[PDB]
Amino acid sequence: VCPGTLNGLSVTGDAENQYQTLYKLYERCEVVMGNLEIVLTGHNADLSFLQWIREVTGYVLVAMNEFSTLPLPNLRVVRGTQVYDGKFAIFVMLNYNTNSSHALRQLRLTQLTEILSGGVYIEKNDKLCHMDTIDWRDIVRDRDAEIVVKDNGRSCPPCHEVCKGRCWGPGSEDCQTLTKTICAPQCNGHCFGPNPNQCCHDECAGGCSGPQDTDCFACRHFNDSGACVPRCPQPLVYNKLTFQLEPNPHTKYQYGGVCVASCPHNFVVDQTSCVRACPPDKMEVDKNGLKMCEPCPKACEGTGSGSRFQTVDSSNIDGFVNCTKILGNLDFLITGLNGDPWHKIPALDPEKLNVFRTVREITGYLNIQSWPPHMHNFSVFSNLTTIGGRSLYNRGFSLLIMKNLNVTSLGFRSLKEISAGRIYISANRQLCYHHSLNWTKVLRGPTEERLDIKHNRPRRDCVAEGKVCDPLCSSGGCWGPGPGQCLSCRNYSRGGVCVTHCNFLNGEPREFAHEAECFSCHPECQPMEGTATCNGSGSDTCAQCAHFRDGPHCVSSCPHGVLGAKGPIYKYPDVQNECRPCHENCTQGCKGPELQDCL
Amino acid sequence: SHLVKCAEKEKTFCVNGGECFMVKSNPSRYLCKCPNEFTGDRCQNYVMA
Amino acid sequence: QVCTGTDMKLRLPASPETHLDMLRHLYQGCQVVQGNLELTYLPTNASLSFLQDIQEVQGYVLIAHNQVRQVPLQRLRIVRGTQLFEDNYALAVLDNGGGLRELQLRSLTEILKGGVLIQRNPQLCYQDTILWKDIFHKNNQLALTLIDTNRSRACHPCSPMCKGSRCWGESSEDCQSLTRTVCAGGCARCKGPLPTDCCHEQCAAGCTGPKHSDCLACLHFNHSGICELHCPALVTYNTDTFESMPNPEGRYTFGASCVTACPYNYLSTDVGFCTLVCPLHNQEVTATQRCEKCSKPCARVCYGLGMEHLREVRAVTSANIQEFAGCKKIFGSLAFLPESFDGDPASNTAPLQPEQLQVFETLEEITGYLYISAWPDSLPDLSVFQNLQVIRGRILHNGAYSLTLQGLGISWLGLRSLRELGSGLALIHHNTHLCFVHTVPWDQLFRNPHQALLHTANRPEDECVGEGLACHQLCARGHCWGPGPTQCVNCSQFLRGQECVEECRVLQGLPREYVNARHCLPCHPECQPQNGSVTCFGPEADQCVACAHYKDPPFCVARCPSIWKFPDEEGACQPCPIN
Ligand SMILES: *[C@@H]1O[C@H](CO)[C@@H](O[C@@H]2O[C@H](CO)[C@@H](O[C@@H]3O[C@H](CO)[C@@H](O)[C@H](O[C@H]4O[C@H](CO)[C@@H](O)[C@H](O)[C@@H]4O)[C@@H]3O)[C@H](O)[C@H]2NC(C)=O)[C@H](O)[C@H]1NC(C)=O
Ligand SMILES: *[C@@H]1O[C@H](CO)[C@@H](O[C@@H]2O[C@H](CO)[C@@H](O)[C@H](O)[C@H]2NC(C)=O)[C@H](O)[C@H]1NC(C)=O
Ligand SMILES: *[C@@H]1O[C@H](CO)[C@@H](O[C@@H]2O[C@H](CO)[C@@H](O)[C@H](O)[C@H]2NC(C)=O)[C@H](O)[C@H]1NC(C)=O
Ligand SMILES: *[C@@H]1O[C@H](CO)[C@@H](O)[C@H](O)[C@H]1NC(C)=O
Ligand SMILES: *[C@@H]1O[C@H](CO)[C@@H](O)[C@H](O)[C@H]1NC(C)=O
Ligand SMILES: *[C@@H]1O[C@H](CO)[C@@H](O)[C@H](O)[C@H]1NC(C)=O
Ligand SMILES: *[C@@H]1O[C@H](CO)[C@@H](O)[C@H](O)[C@H]1NC(C)=O
Ligand SMILES: *[C@@H]1O[C@H](CO)[C@@H](O)[C@H](O)[C@H]1NC(C)=O
């Protein structure tokens, strides 16, 4: 199992680097989670590493190369979830040298059984043999799909006598196996034999070894612990005569093509299924352990695969005004800052990045490959508290910081959780303050194989130049130099900034302890010297009253002109500065409890 | 081969120093050959590791 | 096309005189019976031709205690057996002796669950000539058959055309067709012995071709002529992008078939099923009704008979009458039996009193049935339920009736607010003092093509005319629930509060009124009466033509409010000099 590609006909580097990239990516890969794109490969390339591929999720693209054979003898299922040109799941084009010295002559796809979506495009291949002798409608599932297979070969030999005119090559081991066009009239799909009792299950992708949902080669929808099913077990059982729905004692959730006992902690649960985000008519609601979708808030969507944009840019960044939670990924690429003249998109004003200072959660990944040359940190994301990781870069990555050559610190001072994925922070020649940071307090679960932080500013020079974070910070470290960028303070914080102590026994703005932070005492509280000033910020939590006492509360003066359950209320001060109600016949106040004391 | 260099306007298709090529074909098909450190259909992304 | 079955088993008809009409209305035009098909206690030569259209039965088929020679069920293909007759048996033919001579079940080739009873029928000849093993499904069954051969009749051999002697009756069209036990391979059903002639995996009873569109009956669900394992979901899931989205091709499940919208009287659900009750932790919500989840604690639910702790309770008695106090809607049925208003020494339960029945005064909606076979002899009507608007009929008495009145002493029906009988039949019979039944617009209360009123033995129409029992002269269509001006279905003049009247007190008298959409309502106490003209334009102190006492703009008042004002010589309030 490995990730696929999406480069189309483009390539990176020279002929040897194009091959080494292809080799390393697919070296022991059985299932390609994307496209299989083999473009401009040389005539002497060893492609035997592809022999283990059984299944392709997207399309198979083979173009403008010079190798003689395509060694995919085990590829059975091509799902076509992504389609080349919008039509074709297999695209084979121009695979020959213009001087005819080298060309592709054989596609070794002898086990290819089914294409679940899309057609077949095999065109312009002067030396490619046996393509008009393949019963391609036995393989292509969709009856409305386009099949070309035209200008391929000239003097090519016929199929071997044992193949009955249907083959992938000249040999007796090259014959095509027909699994759909020779079936019993009743079966609507692939078979394992010609009898009406020898047909494959409706949920199978490609062939099968028997008629059961556990004899199946691959599933079309969900795999329920070995059994292919159209849906996972539902919470309610329906009675066709009484029209009742009874609870199902054995339910499961739908998650990415497999049935699971419970939904992953970083996903939101819909009706029996786990999704990255809720439907347009639902919002995410926090429950016990898991999140759920319920019957909305602004649809502040992100960038990357599944969205309309590949990066934040001068025509996209305005969509995040007043955004607190981004659905999906947030990508910053070089073209997103410098501009993209191909689409008439101007360069981004560096100070428009301040629109992200209100974002507290990103449900996907954060990917920064470009940042303005005068911005030495990512303080624009100082308000970010969670990276959800429900959609990851390539596979596994939930945070990327690559080659930002003017950045000295990470920032993200409010960040408490990265719920899933891997961290890649590398090649940033100025980046220094990350070396002391303890990632097991930020990244959830085991971290032994998830933290990739190579190169950057050497730690030796970072400490030697005096870049170790403020001494007030505890073991675990900081996001930068300041006392406000620490994960946790040694003693107390004051508004999120680390301090040596609180103003408990002394200090004009007297304070009290609460949740390891310093908080001020009530304005009417009497300051203490040598003992605690207060136990809270309320009018009844102080050690002594600064002015006048009114029952349990301290006040600056006794109240006058107050309207309560019985109308106007007036109180007078006593010799000890205590407030008491005035006589029943007083007007606007009094000097005592008696009738003669009224004003 | 089967590829030719892109025209003065078309050379704008690819980014980050990549060289733009055309496939010789009724519809236009655009290629770019990226530097070793860049990938993606237009060379717009960095290569990891 | 689609209708429900009954729940009588072997019990007597509630009103024998209307029993054949009950069966006619329930089954006339049905192809699919979504319940048990019960044909019992029929007279000799009954008019049974309305049964010829039935092709499927969801539950059991019971034919018992009938004098008829034949039952026209030749088109019946499949009996699904969802409920069985006692347990064990899906087809039962019992005590039909006069009596049945032939089974005639020409099209029946499938029973999915249960066995067969054919017992004590001293006329029936063709119960031994059926290969019942070919009719039972391939799937695991009890498949038990108990066949009574004690017929005492000189039976004719079946037509020589019936090769192998398998037959439903004497005629050449009565030969049994064998569709499981005569075919090559492992196929559950077939057209013929050859390996090319098997039916599709989703076919039941048989087929006209090998495709899932060629079936005679669907084993699981029918989707617009196509037989499917599961009905298409309303909402789908993308395994590559981890998102859900609506299915443009999604359908609701309704019994054994798929529909585009959930049928009337059923609650829709987001999972795609149509039900009669909601799943646990939900609420019924109107739009047409749907079930929705209790995202906050569920509201008070007033349960009736047949639901939760009252499932085994026959009737409302002095022990459970209080459980309905303050309720607007009852989730269940109501039954008033001779034991409700009498004593029960088994638990020392007191009889209900007329003043205890008042607990239903607030009731507007019943989800089940209203069955009244006893009522106090001191109450001339059913006015205890005068505020009842809707009877849904989701639970039916004997599986057929939603409103039943038997043997009551009431002079007229008290149900003046009733506007809907959502499902089921109405049965009113043997009420010798009850006159106002023919005066009720029953065609405006029924909602379904299979509803009707069945009645007999009530007060004769000619005796009502003689005595003087008729609708009030102001009833809009000549339609009413009783003799009074408050009991009209609609009023030709004014509705006052709860009464139809000739005129509204707008132009003449002291207690003046105004008219609003044919309701006649009083003017504000501070409004001055206008002699020969309009008094007021509404119930408020600022809507009158003139002030009765002193003006306090915009309204009239008896005494000036504390700015403190006084009643001046102008006929209006003015600020006081004392402050
Ligand atoms: C799956 O469900 C579909 C409905 O979605 C169901 O289709 C209906 O089947 C019935 C018969 O099984 C069809 O009714 C007949 O159609 C023919 C068409 O020409 C008419 O000739 C028939 O009318 C004659 O018979 C009547 C009998 O009393 C006479 O009164 C009348 O005068 C005529 O002589 C009759 O209407 C019905 O048309 C279809 N509906 C559709 C839309 O096709 C289907 O059978 C179900 N399949 C399975 C396998 O369960
Ligand atoms: C359904 O899922 C199961 C895993 O639960 C898959 O079984 C594994 O298949 C690989 C194939 O090489 C074997 O190496 C493993 O040993 C299998 N696991 C077990 C527990 O047997 C199965 O292949 C899937 N089936 C389909 C049809 O997709
Ligand atoms: C980084 O953080 C982790 C998690 O807080 C620290 O691991 C904990 O260390 C204390 C030390 O006594 C143990 O009591 C806990 O049980 C540890 N937690 C877990 C989950 O193992 C770790 O010490 C910190 N520092 C470093 C350098 O890793
Ligand atoms: C939302 O956006 C507008 C943009 O001008 C701004 O005026 C407003 O104050 C914003 N703030 C919040 C908190 O909604
Ligand atoms: C972040 O960078 C800006 C300029 O890029 C600088 O003024 C500021 O002091 C930095 N903040 C910290 C905490 O280093
Ligand atoms: C988010 O930004 C506002 C800006 O004033 C700030 O008050 C708030 O404390 C920040 N929240 C977090 C989680 O950092
Ligand atoms: C009545 O029916 C049973 C059916 O098995 C049979 O055993 C019994 O001998 C019959 N005969 C008479 C004469 O009652
Ligand atoms: C009452 O009956 C009359 C008869 O013509 C009709 O005009 C009026 O609309 C009816 N009112 C209601 C509420 O149905």
Strand blocks (E) in C457-572: 513-516, 519-522, 550-552, 555-557, 565-567
- Mind giving me the DSSP string for C247-306? -TT--EEETTEEESSPPTT-BB-TTSB-BSSPPTTEEEEE--EEEEE-SSPPPP-EE-BT
Report the separation in Å between the CA atom of A441 and the middle of ligand 3, taken as the mean of its atom positions: 8
B chain contacts of residue A334, beta-carbon cutoff 8 Å:
15-16, 44
- The angle subtended at Cα C202 by Cα C200 and Cα C203, nearest 5°, is 70
Q: What share of residues in chain B are helix, strand, coil (percent, to 5)?
A: 5, 35, 60
Question: Could you say which residues from 1 to 49 on chain B have a Cβ atom under 8 Å away from some Cβ of chain A?
Answer: 1-3, 12-13, 15-16, 18, 23, 29-36, 38-48
User: What ligand 3 atom has the least distance to the C-alpha of A440?
Assistant: 2
First to last CA, chain B: 32
Q: Tell me if residue C461 falls in helix, strand or coil.
A: helix
Chain breaks in chain B (C to N over 2.5 A) after: 24
Alpha carbon distance A147, A138 (integer Å): 12
Q: Tell me if residue C165 falls in helix, strand or coil.
A: coil
Contact yes or no for C378/C351 (Cβ under 8 A): no
CATH numbers and ranges of domains, chain A: 1-178 (3.80.20.20), 236-294 (2.10.220.10), 317-468 (3.80.20.20), 557-597 (2.10.220.10)
Question: Does residue A336 have its Cβ closer than 6 Å to ligand 5?
Answer: no
Q: Considering every ligand atom shown, identify the ligand nearest to the alpha carbon of residue C205 and give its number.
A: 1
- Mind giving me the DSSP string for A487-536? SSBSSEEETTEEES--SSSS-SS-EEEETTEEEEPPTTBPPPSSS--BSS
Q: Which residues pair with A268 in a beta bridge?
A: A275, A291
User: Which of A438, A439, A453 is the best mutation target for the ligand 3 pocket, counting ligand atoms within 8 Å of the beta carbon and taking the most?
Assistant: A438
**In this structure, which amino acid lies at residue A585?**
N
Q: Which helix H or strand E contains A69, and what residues bound it?
A: strand A69-70
Q: Tell me if residue A18 falls in helix, strand or coil.
A: helix
Q: Does C253 touch chain A if contact means CB atoms closer than 8 Å?
A: yes
Q: Does A306 touch chain C if contact means CB atoms closer than 8 Å?
A: yes
Resolution in Å, one decimal, please: 3.1
Q: Which residue has the tokens 């077939």?
A: C190
Q: Exposed e or buried b for every residue in A58-87, given b needs 16+ CB within 10 A?
A: bbbbbbbbbbeebbbbbbbbbbbbbbbeeb
- Cα C47 to Cα A276, A532, C168, distances in angstroms: 63, 100, 22
A11 contacts B12? CB cut-off 8 A: no
Dihedral sign (CA A577, A580, A586, A589): positive
Q: Tell me if residue A237 falls in helix, strand or coil.
A: strand
Q: Which residues pair with A362 in a beta bridge?
A: A326, A387
Q: Which of B32, B44, B48 sits opposite A333 (nearest CB)?
A: B44
Which residues are within 8 A (CB) of C63 and not within 5 positions of it... i.e. 6 or more apart? C39, C40, C71, C92, C93, C94, C96, C100
Q: Exposed e or buried b for every residue in C336-373, given b needs 16+ CB within 10 A?
A: bbeebbeeeeeeebeebeeebbebbeebebbbbbbbbb
What is the DSSP pairing of strand A497-499 with strand A492-494?
Answer: antiparallel
CATH number, domain with residue C21: 3.80.20.20
Query: What are the residue boundaries of the structural domains of chain B, listed by start?
Result: 1-49
Residue nearest to atom 2 of ligand 8 (CA): C476
Alpha carbon distance A593, A369 (integer Å): 77
How many CA atoms lie less than 13 Å away from A534 in the CB half-sphere? 27
A11 contacts B31? CB cut-off 8 A: yes
Smallest Cα distance from C434 to chain A, Å: 36
User: What ligand 5 atom has the least distance to the C-alpha of A409?
Assistant: 14
Query: Residue A316 burial (CB < 10 Å; 0-12/13-18/19+)?
Result: middle
Can you read off the two tokens belonging to residue C59?
């539950």
- Cα B20 to Cα B12, B37, B46, C36, distances in angstroms: 8, 17, 18, 75
How many CA atoms lie less than 13 Å away from A598 in the CB half-sphere? 9
Smallest Cα distance from B17 to chain A, Å: 12
Smallest Cα distance from A62 to chain C, Å: 23
A197 contacts C244? CB cut-off 8 A: no
Q: Tell me if residue A411 falls in helix, strand or coil.
A: coil
What residue in A sits closest to C207 (Cα-Cα)? A186
Alpha carbon distance A411, A16 (integer Å): 40
Smallest Cα distance from B38 to chain A, Å: 7
Which residues are within 8 A (CB) of C115 and not within 5 positions of it... i.e. 6 or more apart? C88, C89, C90, C91, C141, C142, C143, C144, C145, C146
Can you read off the two tokens belonging to residue A573?
């001060």
Q: In what order do the strands lie in the sheet with A36-39?
A: A36-39, A60-63, A88-93, A119-123
How many CA atoms lie less than 13 Å away from C169 in the CB half-sphere? 18
Contact yes or no for A125/A98 (Cβ under 8 A): no
Smallest Cα distance from C293 to chain A, Å: 9
Which chains are within 8 Å of C by 3+ CB pairs? Answer: A
Q: Which residues pair with C418 in a beta bridge?
A: none
CA A514 to mean position of chain CA atoms: 36
Q: In what order do the strands lie in the sheet with C115-119?
A: C37-40, C61-64, C89-94, C115-119, C145-147
Experimental technique used? cryo-EM
B16 contacts A7? CB cut-off 8 A: no
User: Which of A318, A321, A325 is the best mutation target for the ligand 4 pocket, counting ligand atoms within 8 Å of the beta carbon and taking the most?
Assistant: A321
Contact yes or no for A340/A332 (Cβ under 8 A): no
Q: Which helix H or strand E contains A572, and what residues bound it?
A: strand A571-573
Do C and B touch, counting CB pairs below 8 Å (3 needed)?
no
Alpha carbon distance C335, A155 (integer Å): 91
Dihedral sign (CA C538, C540, C543, C549): positive
Q: Which residue has the tokens 């010079």?
A: A66
Range of the domain at C31: 2-147
Q: Considering every ligand atom shown, identify the ligand nearest to the alpha carbon of residue C122 and give its number.
A: 7
Task: Return the closest-CA partner of residue A362 out of A333, A328, A331, A396.
Answer: A328
Task: Identify from A55, A238, A246 which residue to disrupt to test chain C contact, counting C C-beta atoms within 10 A and taking the largest count.
Answer: A238
Can you read off the two tokens belonging to residue C199?
């039916």
Alpha carbon distance A502, A518 (integer Å): 5
